[model samples]
Target: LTAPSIKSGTILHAWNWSFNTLKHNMKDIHDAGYTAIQTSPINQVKEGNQGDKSMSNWYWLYQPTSYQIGNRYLGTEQEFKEMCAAAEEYGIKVIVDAVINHTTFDYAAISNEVKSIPNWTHGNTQIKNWSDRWDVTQNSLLGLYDWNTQNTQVQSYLKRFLERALNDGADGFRFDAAKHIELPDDGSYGSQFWPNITNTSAEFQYGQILQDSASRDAAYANYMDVTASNYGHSIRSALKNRNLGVSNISHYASDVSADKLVTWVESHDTYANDDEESTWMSDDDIRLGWAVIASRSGSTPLFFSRPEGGGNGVRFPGKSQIGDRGSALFEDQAITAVNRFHNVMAGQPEELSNPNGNNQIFMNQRGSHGVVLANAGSSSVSINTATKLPDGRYDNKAGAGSFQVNDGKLTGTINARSVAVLYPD
Candidate 1:
């Protein structure tokens, strides 16, 4: 029961399949109560396999040269549009996995020019004279070719590519390798990074800093850096509702003033090498960690695909086996539990509250009226509430557990690695 953050909805996730397979699976995902699907990059790739038979063959779609929406996993742009349309028909939104970071590392290294440029050439155009990248070495982060985003020509090219996707009915975007989108320091990318940004000029800030700082840091002050800052802020704004503007996601939720942004902890590129260790989290633990983000005052949380069973492959660098017959459908359980909790908390702002715990715990209070206790835990824990629900019967939908309430006191034994929703009439 995985939850979609923006609203009361479910998410459909996919990997390593053709567009046809994606479309086919998406149908079932929608039927299973998903309201959105986060797909891999729908762009074309360079020739030849990398190393691993199945994996290296499709290393990173995020290394896109063009926003043509044509790749090995899917067909052409039209095919992608068709998939989005079908999902939309089922009340599902499409969140494009945007690769705005660096254009194809290989293509950039070979062509030495961002693809958006017409007849891009190595000798004619190249990224040199980097300010912050003074210590740049041969084996840099991600092992991908870095673009000169500090270049006026490069920024124009990126905008054109991003604008194309927005026009194609993309509800939101999961920025691939977002950290690389900005310069290593500050304005190493270019001066005019954002052109469409009229009211305020585009600024470029270090993506690394945005996560750790509250207000803008003048330490790396520059116009384009600031523009990137605003863009980052705008993305969040467009995705969230007004009420949820109190927490960290407030900017993302508020920045994306129009469309919703799909927020995630990690993606293919960022945690590629350490996939197993990264995804080693248990389903219940994952829920406990993610529930806090999902139930935030604002902004939506995205659930990436993770494989199951055991092994390092089962943990991280591996993709989720979600739709596969053998895979555990964590999405089904996570969403159902979160959505139910959200429903119970809606409207009654104060009644809904977050409690401190070793595991994720949220409470929906009815004051003296009644209360709903939601525990997203992997271990059983006793819940003691002064304002217990009315004496009645209740069950845990997330797993096996049941008990009765009497004279304002409710008690029950909950299963490990699951969620419990307690209610009393």
Candidate 2:
């Protein structure tokens, strides 16, 4: 498949948000400097609650019932189109979450009046061992029926599904459970399913290959961009441990090229889950982490929107739903400033630095276009170093005090637990 030009700016993952909600916030999203908004699965899904009607988790969107355009929870077909049109007016592209690996076990419960092709579904058998490669690719996940993607008929069905999304104004797709689908040279499948769907009318595509091996990752990169899940985990660990050094920042997703990796500090699953794995960072810290990733040289960064009143390792009680306009972090001054800085420094080579010989105070320069200084320490630290930046004064977009670069030596004091993004005057 011919790859479309990948959009360069930040991507906002508006998880589980209804189409109308996204429509209402497109202006804010665009204004906040995001280039695209990725919506939850728009295809038809199970209507009723999965387990209990009272408490709704966000996972239901992944359990699709049919490949239709509209779903009961997200919005109607007209609303989805209207949302896309509104986003287009503001120069914001819409990316839909394409869930093709599986379908709801109870396919008869689909509300869209469409039925799944019986021959297209693998029998209702749960995958027992995750380490078993064959089971991982072909078996059911959480009792959901896996698709026989190798079948010619199933490939046609999925292609039509994605084509309809593109026809409705979607600019790209984020393939859900992408690793579950077998690779092209899987011996049995023999390079048919992926090429069939990827080579279709869809232009831009990426996959969520969660925690896969380096060899497997390299193979997928041949098809489309893959998520930098390891990078995100490294960032989270560095932030949680208060060791935001140049080494930690530089060690992320070293195997994949920057252009092919999608970087994020936290994803929908990480931010909303109340389990022990969900380590929450302060809003101030979140901004700092965002600055580290956003001001970097490569890889597309994604901003995740947690539900209102949700944070600190606690999922908000009740159903996970679309966030309101007031809950958006894009309006945050620091976030907006960092995003703008990212746009300006695009394609520049990054130079990592530690002026004080302390890992707590780290900084990097983007080929003289911009400089980002981060301090994760408890006390303020003075930074003095030579930069590629020209000799002049630069504004600190993160609200820290400005700095002066005299004869290539830039000097400034970065506040505790904060970041300073400087742009050339």
Candidate 3:
């Protein structure tokens, strides 16, 4: 179970923002109703820039040079501690990005620092065949130095580093490249590294398991909750194809338990890179998609920060970074209303229904605590479906309009490509 601290709240990914910047924005994020903030990697990483001379990509944060806290791009150790303290003050938890699978590509960069550690690496060989399990687990990923997790000494060092992070005030960790490490029962190379690290006092612990296979699902879910990549992809496809009425979006959670899934429409990787799974929906579609996931009965939804100029664009340093501080989408009135609705309707059973049977309007009810009506087509649709709410007037938290329920049925006109979140006044 997710710890009480984060069980019902949304997580905001403040990608690549420095600790100081996060500290400054804590109040707004809290007021925006985010329960937790997931920060970029805080460990010291390969110190350099990558990209055209005008703008640089921030992938170096993924290549660790040391386990020490703070880095050149993010901030100093003092700033990190300050950020954590600020989060606590605002009633929010901080989840750090833990990149433990590999080290920097240039061995000489940290050679002297890690030379004395016994069996620290896997012979510096790049993965040739991704299909072969052995090569995938033991070989380097994109030339980054792979760590030998089977070694006790390696486990001890990593454990101590994480303990230090917890002591510094982080509430949880997001394990990076988790699949590169072998499972405990994987024959000769079994490591059991996850059990040691996961059994902690942290409030939340989830891994990034990019694969969508059943075997991979069981393995990662056994340790902790995993990012529901399958769910994200399905939701994206449905919205992109304009076939939302025919798509049973909730069915995506069948493969994995909703309790053990973290849902998102777009992640950091999907937004910044031109990958095949990248979502190309407009801002309106993104909000509507978020409404579906956020209003669902189970699963924790993560709201990703859309970089300036949208994805595949640069986030200039200083105040001109990604994620508009004052835009309506950033404030996201609909998401905020849905989040509150979810909280009030906690543990309530959901009743899914199609009001008009036209495949253009759908409704999700939380046993009368709240209701979400979605209109996916280009034309306005009037729904007259039975609802759980008692006969009365209700206010639409999304600010679209008001609705009326009489004799256990709701009647309202939902605007095109918008959602109506209603709660009894």
Candidate 4:
């Protein structure tokens, strides 16, 4: 079966895969059951070849030289159009990472064409006060040339960039550094950035708003779905601490509709950042986290595939160059099962419960199937608990096992800190 839809299905963030390489992997990606695939920023950027296959080269993609449709390591514009066409053949969508907020910090390095453009800089001052809304929206971030998003001329550049990608057959966008671009309601300094740029033909668009504030989330969600940064923190913390209880697992960001959120386990920011966030999370840890997040209803989940050879033995960006594939965990049975399960149970409501009152033994029940994760601390645990699946014998798709749902009660055994996806056979 094919993946569902971008609004409701799972996305495999092919973090650093080139458009050509990604085109080559379309069938594998679709067969693995992802409805959409997100690429690294798809624009021309500062040129360089960093020594190691380390994650260092990835930043070059983010720092756009201009709004051109292709980057050096990410392949040419022709490759991108073909990639989108391949996505259509596979019956999935492609999301181009949009970096409309700033250009590379080395001002002189930017193309003369981009520099000659009108209304390029909102202000020359570098942002020093992060908590100040005006400073955040109006000033440069990390010394990059912040665009005057309010200027219709600047909006025209971004709109043209989006249209260029859509002309290539891209279906959606993931706005990078979205919070730095102001919302219309953020006081007098706020600009109507969303409305001006969001009138594109893309099917879905989400932003990377990193604030933990509920009000801020709701504000951004008004224009498009938002990144649940805090909820991601909760999920990582739960996985790290082995606490998958109802309260720990079910409580999402406060005051925002869960359906209006874009959720992730180890976002690129959380994975490769100044501080080593989730850099050490094992493959099993990530798989378990996905089982929980992807199995739940609402919020499209993004699986950040770690760099190839990365996350195993020596850690991320593992001996692989910028254009190579990341961790093959996306193809693992557990992950594939969760991806398909998420697609199969599209509109089912979710129920998070700790069976047998054991906080470590958690279960997420949807109508036709359910996932039971047991974090029984270094030991496997047996759980006979409430399930919503129809009464019948079932097999676990994530691992080698079988369980049965009888009269609303599900009897299953999961390995320590592993997940079991039980569905009627």
Candidate 5:
């Protein structure tokens, strides 16, 4: 299945998967309906393993030691370019995780080339209050040297870094800790971080603003897509309770429009940290959430691939291995079917309805083209409800079933705790 564009297509956050591993799976990724595959930070990071190379020390990858790519764990610069070449062959785009917010906390460990530039290392201390605008934008985060984005030298450095990534075939970027960098609209400490740095030809770009006020996110949205983190929590709560009532969903995160939002079930930070929430969710639950989000229009969905381990009890079960296969769930038919539905039905109007009386059966209809039915109940349920389609029989792309839509009324039965994506076969 081919994807339309990153703005409307889904993404598979390849988490800790190595460049070669991603290259190896490009065909499968493309067939699964993902237009892009997001990688962990590609830059050199402060080196250390808290334990065996499993999932324990994944945070170190976020702590940059250099602006250059080809971090040994992901592989050499040559290998990354090679992966991009393979991605191009499969029509899949590569989204690099740009970690420009701060570097490794150890000041002395920073390279002289980076430190030689004045204002390269801005504040001497870490942020004390996360809520304060100045502290967040200027002060270091977790003791890492915050880049003085106001400084032209620093902007040029990052600009050069981004340019190099594009040169290496990076199709887009996920700006790490973007909220820490103030928007141009802010007072006093505000800088032209977005204007000066993001003038790239990237197919798509989003900032990891995490969760913030609507006004703040809107300001950032002017420059790039913002994360729908609050919406993720809302969706998780609904999924946890086995209820997908439309009223239960906070659909729009903050006040940002769905078009400017990048939605996710969970991010690496939400799972990789000891302060975990999404980390405890089962794989089945994750897929269920993916179906709901991916079936919608506008907001691009990012499906976070967990570490390669069994679900439920085994958390990050191996040494913190770099380049590991995140999970086979990424290629699961249910996810791929939703992906295909999303890709095929791009630009169509979207509507959500609890087709089955109870919240256990929610139908996300994408105009007359497709509908994703998610059954959170314990048994198969048949739902006959309003729809946008004229009249026809649609095959379930994820499983064995057929949905018949007659005179704008749709009818179908979906399996329990599973998803059914219907489109013209």
Candidate 6:
């Protein structure tokens, strides 16, 4: 569960996949002051028809045909390596989006030999047998094909691919479509499919991009569970109590363990489908959310690229550039603020003991180091605690503003959509 404190950035568009586009866009990320950029999957892609099939291309990237790293979107393998090296030279680490879940179900492209796995196709994949997965029918989980992880050959194939990237200088991996990892008792009794084969729900969750909706409700799987921890918050819940259905936030934190969760309110993919519904949380919502995340026992802080620039508001009619103005504005200021915060607090303590129970008012103690706060709601929040250094006036890093304190209490009218970092000096 212990990993480095990661202050990460994300690239959520097709541009991040293209060599030139990625090369150019990555510079913007570096110039903007991000240490890490989460690049999308880079592997062999599948050709799909228009409409659902066109949309299917996005999923196809998740269903890797080969681990050669010769993806067209990410350019040639050499280019990807060069890009990573360049980013590192500038002190930025590259976090590749590893899609280790499954392979393509596209029969036309996949050879008959690889497709021979029982119920591995899109029409026959065992994942479809699990009723719980039905909730996502409106959208593809981007599950191309369910892998027989029991197969040593498949494990070796995917693992080698991952190891190569890490060895090639990838700082870490943000696994894509990881919920598809299948277990033996994944299906129901009446709908007996893939029997006698049992796997750990926690292990599958840790496997990355494997399905767990079925395992979450199972008694045996829960009993045999190994992964247990919590790392993030529900951005949607903070905005409105609308259930985006049940995402396995608990399992996600458990699998990653405490302090290792790179939590974010929204991502590129999550933003694409439900733009209106996804990021209802304003800047203040994000600021408050960040305070909660930063003060947690986790090791990493993952802020998606969207909230920085009104990313939630961006809705393109069709195939257009990611040039939405509102989203751009949000990205500019938000990313700037976030990057600056991380840089300034680089050496700060990681133990966040108390995240105020109230979502409107969040406070995380930095291991007696200091406290971070964000007023998600209207009005002000006060930090009434004793301090080590004598204080007259201190700067509140929210909106690049400052405040005064007579004793040790850090109290003020925290503006709407603003975050305040309180230094207990």
Query: Judged by TM-score relative to the true structure, which candidate is superior, 2 or 3?
Result: 2
Candidate 4 residue-wise lDDT, 41-114, digit = tens: 98888775642345666767777788888766878999999999998998989998999999887777788768
lDDT of 4 at 126: 89
Cα displacement (angstroms), candidate 6, residue 402, comes to 1.5
Q: RMSD of model 3, in Å?
A: 3.0
Q: Each model's RMSD to truth, in Å?
A: 8.5, 3.2, 3.0, 1.9, 1.8, 7.4
- Among the numbered candidates, top TM-score falls to 5
Model 5 scores what on Cα lDDT?
A: 0.83
lDDT for each of the candidates? 0.44, 0.75, 0.75, 0.80, 0.83, 0.46
Q: Provide TM-scores for the models.
A: 0.65, 0.92, 0.91, 0.95, 0.96, 0.68
Candidate 3 lDDT, 262-306, residue by residue in tens: 888877787655452454656677767777777776687887765
Could you give candidate 2's per-residue lDDT for residues 178-210 as a string of tens digits? Answer: 888888786565447777788755555888888
**lDDT, model 1:** 0.44
What TM-score would you give candidate 5 relative to the actual structure? 0.96
Clashing pairs in 3: none
Error of 1 at 205 (Å): 17
lDDT of 5 by residue, 220-298 (tens): 8889999988999988888889998887673665788999999988888777777677777887788788888888888
Regions of candidate 6 where Cα sits further than 4 Å from its true position:
1-17, 25-33, 49-57, 111-123, 126-143, 182-233, 241-256, 274-284, 307-314, 317-359, 379-390
Model 2 / residue 383 / CA error / Å: 1.1
Which ranges of candidate 4 are over 4 A from the true structure? 1-3, 49-54, 213-215, 312-318, 372-376
For model 1, residues 157-205, the per-residue Cα lDDT tens digits are 6665555655565565544434333333433332334233111211111
Alpha-carbon shift of residue 5 in model 1 (angstroms): 8.8
Worst 10 residues of 6 by lDDT: 198-207
Count of clashing residue pairs in every prediction: 50, 1, 0, 1, 8, 28
Model 5: colliding residue pairs? 18-323, 53-319, 53-320, 53-321, 54-319, 54-320, 54-321, 55-320
